[PDB]
């Protein structure tokens, strides 16, 4: 949701074209009273309570809560036997057929989320294999997220990614309350 | 708009077995968008309903309403097509099983009134439908006699049960 920005908008009776004059006098016509042909009652009139402008749904959970959610996702995968640790993502070949066959043989899910430490260093073989696949998605460690972890049946991690996630998620435990945004220098924070 | 009446003539029945009563022929005909009120056409349709083709033509030839001529033309066309295409042996051996008038697609016009006011005229159009069935017209339903009427009363008496008990 927080990314969501709904671009639905409707014209109110003030924004509908025309509709300035009174359609007919108050009294004597024998018809209903009206003040403009663009009120919500009229066909082609305004929308009383419609979507208004581009609306944002942005809100931030506490970073502690988000880190805890990442931890809970990892624990759920491990407990349900969907987490698979790897020494490295290096493949014998870049053929997507090899990767799909390997997943099927090892009884992985229809969908696999492979995670590597950093984007730049991801092996060329796995990059080629996963670029052509739709249910096998390769992401960097910095991109791990609960939504994708839940969308993908199995979660494949490397040892460096495991260490990275452990450090990043545990720091939230035992960190002080911030003095200023952590992007700024700190005595011990990289 | 619907045009099922025209299609009703295109139904083909399977061949009848030799030991089967001869199926009377049925011919559906209609005229669309007649400049005539369906209400006025209904009276002519009711008049000719249930009669033989010749009797219907005779009545229509001497009725004064405008729709009489249109219905006569439709009936004559129905007779011609029944003989030519539907294998009806005798022209006269046809009777009007169904005859009704349907609302057509009407046009809206303005009628000007006295004080800048107006009404919405309707250039009324109507359809006309006929089914012609081969064979002599079915005999008119005879009025129920006193004997049958008393028979019905006695049947009502006999049907009585002891209501609301074992």
């Amino acid at each position: 949701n927080f990314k969501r920005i709904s671009y639905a908008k409707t014209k109110t009776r003030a924004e509908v074209r025309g509709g300035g004059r009174k359609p007919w006098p108050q009294k004597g016509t024998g018809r209903a009273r009206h003040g403009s042909i663009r009120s919500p009652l009229w066909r082609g009139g305004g929308v009383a309570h419609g979507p208004r402008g581009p609306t944002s749904y942005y809100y931030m959970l506490p970073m502690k809560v988000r880190a805890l959610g990442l931890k809970v996702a990892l624990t759920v995968k491990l407990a349900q036997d969907d987490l698979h640790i790897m020494d490295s993502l290096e493949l014998p070949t870049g053929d997507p057929q090899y990767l799909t066959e390997l997943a099927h043989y090892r009884r992985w899910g229809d969908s696999v989320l492979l995670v590597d430490l950093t984007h730049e260093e991801m092996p060329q073989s796995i990059v080629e294999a996963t670029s052509r696949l739709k249910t096998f998605n390769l992401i960097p460690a910095v991109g791990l997220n609960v939504h994708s972890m839940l969308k993908h049946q199995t979660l494949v991690l490397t040892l460096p990614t495991v260490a990275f996630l452990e450090d990043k998620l545990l720091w939230q435990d035992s960190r002080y309350r911030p003095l200023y945004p952590f992007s700024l220098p700190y005595s011990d924070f990289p | 708009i619907s045009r099922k009446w025209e299609k009703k003539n295109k139904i083909v029945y399977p061949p009848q077995l030799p030991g089967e009563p001869r199926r009377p022929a049925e011919i559906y005909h209609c005229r669309r968008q007649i400049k005539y009120s369906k209400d006025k056409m209904w009276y002519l349709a009711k008049l000719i309903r249930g009669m033989s083709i010749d009797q219907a033509l005779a009545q229509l030839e001497f009725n004064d309403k405008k729709g009489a001529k249109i219905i006569k033309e439709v009936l004559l066309e129905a007779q011609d097509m029944a003989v030519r295409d539907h294998n009806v042996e005798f022209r006269s051996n046809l009777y009007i099983a169904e005859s009704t008038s349907g609302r057509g697609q009407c046009l809206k016009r303005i009628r000007y009134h006295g004080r800048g006011r107006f009404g919405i005229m309707e250039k009324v159009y109507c359809h006309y439908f006929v089914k012609l069935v081969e064979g002599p017209p079915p005999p008119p339903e005879p009025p129920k006699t006193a004997v049958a009427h008393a028979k019905e009363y006695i049947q009502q008496l006999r049907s009585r049960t002891i209501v609301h008990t074992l």
Partner: peptide
């Protein structure tokens, strides 16, 4: 005071439409 409500004329297209 005299009260007069002017007659209202409907748009002409509605009547003039044809098949």
């Amino acid at each position: 005071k005299k009260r007069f409500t002017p007659p209202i004329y409907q748009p002409k297209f509605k009547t003039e439409k044809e098949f």
